[PDB]
Design a protein around this ligand. Structure first.
Ligand code: LMN
Ligand code: T7X
Ligand code: T7X
Ligand code: CPL
Ligand code: 3PE
Ligand code: 3PE
Ligand code: 3PE
Ligand code: 3PE
Lengths: 56, 89, 469, 182, 172, 481, 69
């Protein structure tokens, strides 16, 4: 909105859109984090800590 | 005065570029030496002719025949013909 | 992420007012950007060309499909920006470019259909994804129902797509009847030697290829591209081409096909020759798209076409987006708006643009010379890789024809630049108006990619050698 | 070298403003206005800023100076062309003999011409390490190496002796390089 | 080389061309008994092109006892002659003849195929540097070729000799 | 440095407003730099010396010292150095010849001119097929734009010709380059004579390469684009095109074709001689019936290039040396004639029809002297480099094929005919009624023409001064068993 | 005195190093071309987990004797 205002004049996005924004952002973040952890499980990223915890 | 060491295409492995460049340069330099021999012959012939005048034929027969003989063989011929062909086979 | 976006967006667009369209589209633009950047690291799965079959052998995941997927997201981001942001803040442009209420949901669903086409490992999944994309793209054609041409276009598109879908379903079912299977993975060298599947597989390939408009069935698609709103044409001319071509490349069911050879030749000739006498901008661009689709069709005749195809499709996507965006920007300097769906229509309407905006014409020159294939722009390397592939596989006559077709198409590529660097009597004196920062930055990014991509060629091939070998 | 002075430009601008456009500024061909055109045009060759200010200052001064110089250029050259008079000395004199320097001459004459001179010198002196001289020396050394007794002969007899030996024998090594031939 | 049966192959080509012209006429009708009245002579176009191309190709191939692009060049010349007779102008007739002949000669030179001959292609062929003393095949490369091969292919003279000059002119 | 120099450029632009002083200074610095390089160039070695690599994967934005070379290669030997020196000599004169006649979008014009010059200069540094091709095509967009915006009345058709004909040839060149790439998996010029392709494959690759050479040189029968593109080009475009871009063709033969396809070249040489004799005789004759000044000067270049080709494919050291010397002399002389016809006469009278011009000696004696000198230089007067080039080229051609070379000796006569027929009408007679008196040649025009005249005279009296750079080259490419 | 070229031996050494890097690239190039045409394992090319190509069909009316290796 700062870069290119929707209606010429800058106005902070409404609370509905910001609430939306938080909801979807959390979804993307959780997807990314789940992917990182699973990739550790497959042995694609570094997984020493996870390996030990699994063995125990 | 530089006297780089002579290299031949027959001995070398063509995968070492330094040796291949040396072979190309050596072949060229030998051709140029042969040219110098031809020019020395020709200069001797010129001096012979100029001093012998009317009897230059008898005086300079040997030089004239030799110059005419070395003309077709002592020019440049370039290395591509011999590096790209192996005369044995 | 894509399914979650579709679901949420349906809920919101239901509960939002017509004035919130652009804000919603900005929201999704940023969401897709966030997904592209945060989830990119999943490339690491594909190290050593590791292939994964997923969903009970319905979907296939390898480096190739991951790349096509990222490319499709990048395209969707760029295309959604054109709707989510105003070029100018005047009344004229509010009338010219307003997003429909449901347009974004249709865009996301068509993207989902395209991704499912790419990943399809089984014919049932292929057919369902084809129908999903076909239906969504019918509706995108038809959503601007105030246009007579857009409605006529959507109906013609419905009928031609329906017939081609029936040809595809027939091919799938004949393959089932002969092999009692729905997967190409069941095919092997022994099976291809033993049985004559050529007719069935070529019918399937032709049914898919006529949907992106290869000759001699081009004209209906060029007419549709001409008659749709310009911001719709920027989308519907690109995504189906990518999905169908990528599926065919990945499947490799027409290797050394004589019929595909003849049809690729014909497509090159018709795309090059037929675009010469054009006077409308979008018909010129559609014949451009036909010729480039021919260049990509050639890659279906050979194995190990992954690098050449990926490079070509990426550079073509960038060049296509950029040329459409340049035509869009040049709208602000025309003195006659033809109508509210297609503001500029004739090539001659760009006449003298260099006197109004010199750097817009610079960008136009760069993209055009990429299309012609002038090094070191991306277009040159795309054509170079394609020639490398087809000459390695002994397609000599097709290479000669490709040369000739690039030459011929250079004429109507340079037609644009020619009229653009001519002189106009009424030259902009001044203006307070600023083009939107975001779209100008995006157009500039595309231009800089086309110009200076070649510096990364060797790095790209090094990466490729470890993810696709 | 610093010579800018924003006080002077903000004055020069309206001193220009009074005058007609330089295209129409002399089409009469009274002498008072032509005199002021003479002095203002003379300002063109009175260089008014050096390097320390073009490097340091802001771009508003830049644009203003650029416009000023453009108009000064026009007045100077339009008068000089439609009057056959130079704008120096300050009312329009005819003294065209000398005091004329074009802008290209400094760069060309003081850099390009010395560069071509240098190229010629370098070529002449690089021509000395030619293969003909090298091969004459090498042939002489080959003769002296095989046959070192002509190293005892006096200077004037030497060269004739080397020539004799060259004529008689094939001192080259080419066939030696062609080992697979035999 | 064993002969093409010119008569038979030309007859089958006549049949194929007649059928193709019939199909084109039916289409032409549908897109616009009148079908042949308003045909534009397309049946004749197909029939004449077919007979000309096939007859000239087989004729030339049989006469020269070779199979290569030149036969296609002749056949394209004949086909262009047929197609350019329709203009009823000598320059256009000559232009059709020569240019169609050139295009088809190019086609026959590349292999007279639209798809590829896979077994002969580079991807399916021995490539790279050859081994010890093997004969050169089309796609392979060496560091040195045998001088006898040079003398036979290129021919004697113009600096091509059986023996290097310096070796041959060495004194003893 | 680059950051600081960019700052300097920006400030100069903001204050002065016309980039052209900065470009002139820059080009002069480039000339000085190349001369420094020549100083430090070892001539007793047939190896490329100032090597560097770009866009290598380990360092995409810098130079590569890696053990794997996947970028673009650059470096010079004597043959490249000669043409590079010619290029850096010509560029500042190209900038200077349009110092006053461009009064609109002048910054863009000078940018295009300098960019084209730099592209050609870099092209001469290229050491592998791909980079050579890249920089070989990179000029076409710049030439197209330049000719279209700053050209004469018929400039649109000119721009389309200059783009289309050169693309047409370059794409067949691209076929040959692709075949070489996939067959050898290497592209470099350093060791490409080490690979001995099968004779049939050589014969096939040679076709694409030589089609490119036919369009670019040009040679008969595909030369018809050059006279147009010249006549409607602005002066800088014409000078660059005549003086450098044509020599790119000759350099292309020597660098790309001869070392790799030796045996196929031996097979095809008589066809080359047919085409060169055709271009010489037929274009020289066609020059007699032209009515445009710039068109006639353009037609002269094609014939001189025909003699150059006859020299360069002669398989003799003398022929190759003659081709190079003729290329350099042509690069000196032809820009001067183009300067005359398209910068002095055209900028004074804005017309190129020959009928208007007559008797220029009376009002402009200096211009008449320049015309006489340049024309006798163009037709090959001894003590001019043009004569040395034509003579040595003809020697090589006569040795390679006595009949064809002997017939080609008619070029001396034919060149004299068209050139002197032009200068006869231009210099003498009574001053034309159609045109009025204008100034004589100015200090700038005289400076440029003096540079070119002294260069051609210097290499014409002592052509040996080039030998130190070229004595390896005259043996590097001849194929004698 | 002003001519300071590099030594001939140094020029030869540097060009030989460049050519060696070029030949290394040619060999890597041919290598990758060959490796791409070799055939991968079923796990690497189709499915790492569940790496058995042999199907098991439906399980309702599992008939003794329907299994065939
Ligand atoms: C810049 C101008 C472009 C125009 C010219 C391009 C045309 C290329 C023609 C050359 C070429 C491809 C070369 C491509 C090289 C790169 C491509 C260049 C760029 C592509 C744009 C096509 O050769 C075709 O020539 C046609 C005749 O003209 C034939 O027509 C047909 O003839 C009849 C069918 O038998 C029919 O009746 C009918 O079907 C047609 O009549 C074709 O069959 C034939 O394939 C030759 O390829 C082939 O050559 C042979 C022997 O040479 C090679 O095998 C060799 O076997 C031994 C001897 O056999 C040797 O001992 C051995 O050593 C070597 O292994 C092959 O490996 C293969 O390589
Ligand atoms: C919605 C509409 C719904 C309508 C449904 C009703 C229609 C049903 C059928 C139509 C289906 C769709 C039709 C599609 C067009 C059919 C054309 C088609 O497939 O390509 C052909 C069929 O090659 C036949 O051998 C096949 C020959 C054709 C069969 C013979 C003709 C019979 C007509 C009798 C009179 C495929 O060969 P191809 O290209 O691989 O060609 C070669 C060659 O065949 C091989 O030798 C080579 O090894 C191989 O590399 C390849 O290069
Ligand atoms: C490998 C290939 C993959 C990707 C390569 C593509 C792009 C590069 C990657 C990332 C690109 C990210 C760039 C962020 C930084 C760019 C940046 O300066 O802000 C913006 C554009 O900002 C995007 O429009 C941000 C939009 C991002 C979309 C770019 C994608 C294309 C340009 O500034 P700007 O001075 O005009 O912005 C000013 C200022 O912000 C306002 O306050 C003023 O009122 C207004 O007049 C405005 O002019
Ligand atoms: C911080 C995360 C941001 C990443 C967002 C990526 C968005 C993609 C959007 C559009 C595609 C645009 C260009 C893609 C670049 C190919 C990457 C690659 O290397 O291609 C290879 C495969 O080569 C190929 O087949 C050929 C590709 C054809 C490219 C044609 C254009 C060449 C010129 C582009 C120059 C790059 C600009 C840099 C300017 C400083 C796949 O690499 P990969 O599968 O291992 O994934 C990369 C690792 N990644 C996920 C973290 C990013
Ligand atoms: C880019 C990096 C390299 C550039 C090197 C030189 C940098 C400085 C250029 C310069 O001096 O200015 C260029 C030109 C003049 O500036 P200016 O006076 O402001 O323009 C008049 C209207 N404002 O600025 C302009 O006027 C820009 C006008 C652009 C002209 C549009 C058509 C030209 C297209 C060029 C062809 C490029 C094709 C690329 C394909 C391969 C080429 C290698
Ligand atoms: C700018 C635009 C530049 C465009 C350049 C021209 C592009 C092409 C124009 C049209 C040319 C058409 C060529 C038709 C040639 C006819 C033909 O059949 O060629 C076959 C001929 C022999 O081939 P082959 O079967 O292998 O016999 C071996 C015997 N030694 O093969 C040959 O020996 C070659 C015969 C033609 C030689 C070249 C012709 C000009 C190129
Ligand atoms: C758009 C067309 C397509 C573009 C493709 C290619 C674009 C390239 C962009 C231009 C960049 C090349 C010029 C700069 C590279 C050379 C820099 C350098 O440092 O030279 C390396 C070489 C070895 O140096 P080094 O090993 O470090 O040892 C130093 C010992 N004291 O040191 C040397 O031996 C000196 C080498 C001198 C090189 C002369 C180059 C001539 C022209 C220079 C500018 C050209 C810019 C072209 C712009 C238009 C685009 C072509
Ligand atoms: C159509 C138009 C097509 C245009 C094509 C032109 C492409 C331009 C690409 C530029 C890359 C080539 C630069 C040549 C290298 C010269 C150089 O060395 O610059 C110095 C620095 C790296 O130097 P270094 O690696 O340390 O080696 C020196 C050791 N003595 O180099 C650097 O630090 C990088 C600075 C250059 C940044 C260029 C960014 C793009 C330009 C905007």
């Amino acid at each position: 909105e700062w870069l290119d205002p929707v209606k010429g004049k800058f106005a902070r996005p409404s609370v509905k859109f910001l609430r939306v924004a938080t909801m979807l952002g959390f979804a993307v973040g959780f997807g990314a984090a789940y992917a990182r952890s699973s990739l550790r499980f497959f042995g694609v990223t570094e997984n020493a800590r996870e390996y030990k915890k699994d063995e125990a | 005065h530089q006297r780089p060491e002579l290299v031949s295409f027959d001995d070398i492995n063509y995968n070492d570029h330094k040796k291949v460049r040396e072979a190309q340069e050596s072949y060229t330099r030998e051709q140029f030496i042969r040219l110098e021999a031809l020019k020395t012959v020709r200069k001797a012939l010129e001096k012979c002719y100029e001093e012998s005048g009317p009897n230059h034929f008898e005086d300079c027969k040997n030089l004239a025949e030799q110059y005419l003989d070395m003309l077709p063989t002592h020019r440049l011929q370039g290395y591509l013909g011999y590096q790209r062909n192996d005369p044995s086979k | 992420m894509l399914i979650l976006a579709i679901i949420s967006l349906i809920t919101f667009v239901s509960m939002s007012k017509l004035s919130d369209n652009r804000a919603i589209i900005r929201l999704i633009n940023i969401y897709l950007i966030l997904v592209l950047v945060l989830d990119s690291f999943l490339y690491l799965l594909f190290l050593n060309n590791q292939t994964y079959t997923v969903m009970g052998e319905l979907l296939i995941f390898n480096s190739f499909t991951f790349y096509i997927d990222m490319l499709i997201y990048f395209i969707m981001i760029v295309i959604s920006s054109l709707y989510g942001y105003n070029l100018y803040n005047n009344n004229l442009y509010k009338t010219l470019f307003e997003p429909k209420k449901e347009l974004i949901i249709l865009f996301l669903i068509n993207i989902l259909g395209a991704l499912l086409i790419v990943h399809s490992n089984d014919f049932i999944t292929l057919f369902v994804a084809i129908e999903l994309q076909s239906y969504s793209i019918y509706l995108i054609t038809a959503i601007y129902n105030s246009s007579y041409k857009a409605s006529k276009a959507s109906m013609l598109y419905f009928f031609m797509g329906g017939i081609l879908s029936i040809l595809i379903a027939y091919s799938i079912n004949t393959y089932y009847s002969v092999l009692n299977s729905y997967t190409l993975h069941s095919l092997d060298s022994l099976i291809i030697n033993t049985l004559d599947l050529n007719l069935i597989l070529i019918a399937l390939s032709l049914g898919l290829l006529f949907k992106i408009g290869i000759a001699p069935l081009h004209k209906w698609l060029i007419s549709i591209y001409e008659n749709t709103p310009i911001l719709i044409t920027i989308y519907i001319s690109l995504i189906p081409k990518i999905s169908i071509l990528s599926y065919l490349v990945l499947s490799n069911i027409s290797i050394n096909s004589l019929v595909i050879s003849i049809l690729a030749i014909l497509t090159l000739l018709v795309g090059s020759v037929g675009g010469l006498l054009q006077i409308k901008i979008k018909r010129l661009l559609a014949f451009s798209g036909l010729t480039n689709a021919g260049y990509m069709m050639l890659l279906l005749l050979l194995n190990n076409n992954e690098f050449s195809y990926l490079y070509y499709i990426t550079q073509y996507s960038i060049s296509h987006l950029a040329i459409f965006m340049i035509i869009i920007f040049s709208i602000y300097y025309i003195n006659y708006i033809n109508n509210q769906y297609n503001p500029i229509i004739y090539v001659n309407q760009l006449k003298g643009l260099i006197h109004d905006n010199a750097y817009l014409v610079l960008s136009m020159a760069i993209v055009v010379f990429s299309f012609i294939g002038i090094p070191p722009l991306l277009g040159f390397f795309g054509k170079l890789n394609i020639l490398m592939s087809i000459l390695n596989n002994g397609y000599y006559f097709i290479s000669i024809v490709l040369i000739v077709a690039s030459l011929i198409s250079a004429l109507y590529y340079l037609y644009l630049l020619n009229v653009s660097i001519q002189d106009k009597n009424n030259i902009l004196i001044n203006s307070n108006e600023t083009v939107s920062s975001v779209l100008s930055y995006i157009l500039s990014s595309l231009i800089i990619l086309i110009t200076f991509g070649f510096i990364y060629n060797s790095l790209i091939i090094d990466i490729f050698n470890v993810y696709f070998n | 070298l610093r010579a800018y002075n924003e006080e002077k430009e903000l004055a020069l601008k309206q001193r220009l403003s009074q005058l007609p456009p330089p295209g129409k500024a002399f089409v009469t061909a009274k002498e008072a206005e032509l005199a002021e055109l003479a002095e203002i045009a003379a300002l063109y060759k009175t260089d008014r800023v050096g390097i320390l200010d073009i490097l340091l200052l802001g771009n508003k001064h830049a644009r203003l100076y650029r416009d000023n110089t453009a108009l000064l250029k026009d007045y100077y050259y339009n008068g000089r062309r439609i009057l056959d008079k130079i704008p120096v000395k300050v009312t329009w004199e005819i003294k065209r003999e000398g005091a004329e320097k074009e802008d290209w001459v400094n760069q060309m004459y003081f850099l390009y011409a010395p560069s071509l001179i240098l190229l010629l010198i370098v070529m002449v002196y690089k021509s000395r390490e030619d293969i003909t001289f090298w091969a004459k020396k090498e042939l002489d050394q080959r003769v002296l190496d095989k046959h070192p007794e002509i190293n005892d002969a006096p200077e004037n007899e030497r060269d004739a002796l080397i020539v004799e030996r060259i004529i008689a024998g094939d001192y080259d090594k080419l066939a030696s390089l062609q080992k697979k031939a035999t | 080389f064993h002969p093409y049966n010119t008569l038979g192959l030309a007859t089958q080509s006549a049949m194929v061309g007649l059928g193709a012209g019939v199909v084109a006429a039916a289409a032409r009708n549908s897109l616009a008994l009148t079908t042949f009245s308003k045909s534009g002579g397309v049946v004749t176009i197909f029939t004449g092109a077919s007979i000309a191309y096939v007859f000239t190709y087989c004729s030339a191939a049989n006469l020269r006892e070779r199979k290569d692009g030149w036969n296609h060049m002749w056949a394209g010349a004949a086909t262009g002659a047929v197609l350019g007779a329709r203009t009823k102008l000598v320059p256009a007739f000559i232009g059709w003849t020569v240019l169609c002949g050139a295009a088809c000669g190019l086609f026959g030179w590349t292999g007279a195929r639209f798809n590829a001959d896979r077994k002969a292609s580079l991807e399916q062929s021995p490539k790279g540097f050859v081994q010890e003393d093997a004969h050169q095949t089309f796609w392979e490369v060496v560091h040195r070729r045998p001088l006898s091969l040079t003398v036979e292919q290129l021919g004697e003279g113009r600096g091509i000799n059986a023996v290097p000059i310096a070796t041959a002119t060495e004194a003893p | 440095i680059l950051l600081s120099s960019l700052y300097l450029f920006n400030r100069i632009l903001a204050w002065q407003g016309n980039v052209k002083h900065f470009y002139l200074f820059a080009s002069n610095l480039l000339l000085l730099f190349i001369v420094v390089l020549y100083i430090n160039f070892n001539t007793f070695s047939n190896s490329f010396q100032f090597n560097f690599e770009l866009f290598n994967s380990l360092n995409p934005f810098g130079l590569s010292n890696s053990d794997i070379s996947n970028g673009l290669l650059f470096g010079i030997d004597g043959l490249s150095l000669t043409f590079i020196l010619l290029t850096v000599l010509l560029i500042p004169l190209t900038l200077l010849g349009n110092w006053y006649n461009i009064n609109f979008n002048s910054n863009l014009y000078y940018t295009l001119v300098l960019a084209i010059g730099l592209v050609i200069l870099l092209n001469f540094w290229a050491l592998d097929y791909i980079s050579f091709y890249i920089l070989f095509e990179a000029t076409l967009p710049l030439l197209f734009i330049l000719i279209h915006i700053y050209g004469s009345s018929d400039s649109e058709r000119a721009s389309f010709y200059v783009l289309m004909f050169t693309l047409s040839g370059s794409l067949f060149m691209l076929l040959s380059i692709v075949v070489i790439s996939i067959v050898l998996n290497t592209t470099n010029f350093i060791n490409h004579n080490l690979f001995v392709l099968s004779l049939d494959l050589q014969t096939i690759i040679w076709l694409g390469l030589f089609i490119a050479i036919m369009v670019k040189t040009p040679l008969f029968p595909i030369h018809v684009w050059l006279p147009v593109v010249h006549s409607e080009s602005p002066l800088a475009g014409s000078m660059i095109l005549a003086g450098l871009i044509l020599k790119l063709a000759l350099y292309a033969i020597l660098r790309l074709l001869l070392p790799l396809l030796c045996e196929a070249q031996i097979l095809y040489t008589p066809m080359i001689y047919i085409i060169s004799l055709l271009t010489i005789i037929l274009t020289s004759l066609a020059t007699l019936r032209q009515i445009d000044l710039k068109v006639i000067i353009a037609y002269s270049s094609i014939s001189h290039m025909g003699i150059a080709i006859l020299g360069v494919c002669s398989n003799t050291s003398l022929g190759i040396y003659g081709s190079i010397v003729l290329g350099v002399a042509h690069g000196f002389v032809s820009p001067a004639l183009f300067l005359i016809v398209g910068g002095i006469l055209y900028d004074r009278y804005h017309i190129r029809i020959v009928n208007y011009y007559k008797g220029l000696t009376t009002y402009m004696p200096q211009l008449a002297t320049y015309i006489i000198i340049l024309s006798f230089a163009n037709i090959g007067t001894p003590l001019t480099g043009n004569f040395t080039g034509e003579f040595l080229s003809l020697q090589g051609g006569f040795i390679r094929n006595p009949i064809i070379g002997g017939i080609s000796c008619i070029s001396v006569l034919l060149a004299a005919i068209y050139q002197l027929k032009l200068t006869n009408k231009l210099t003498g007679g009574i001053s034309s009624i159609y045109m009025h008196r204008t100034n004589d040649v100015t200090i700038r025009e005289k400076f440029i023409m003096n540079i070119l005249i002294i260069s051609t005279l210097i290499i014409g009296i002592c052509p040996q001064i080039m030998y130190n750079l070229l004595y390896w080259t005259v043996n590097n490419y001849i194929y004698i068993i | 005195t002003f001519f300071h070229p590099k030594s001939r031996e140094d020029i030869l050494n540097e060009e030989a190093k460049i050519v060696q890097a070029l030949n290394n690239q040619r060999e890597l190039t041919i290598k990758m071309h060959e490796l791409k045409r070799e055939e991968k394992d079923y796990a690497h090319s189709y499915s790492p987990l569940f790496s058995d190509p042999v199907p098991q069909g439906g399980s309702i009316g599992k008939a003794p004797g329907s299994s065939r290796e």
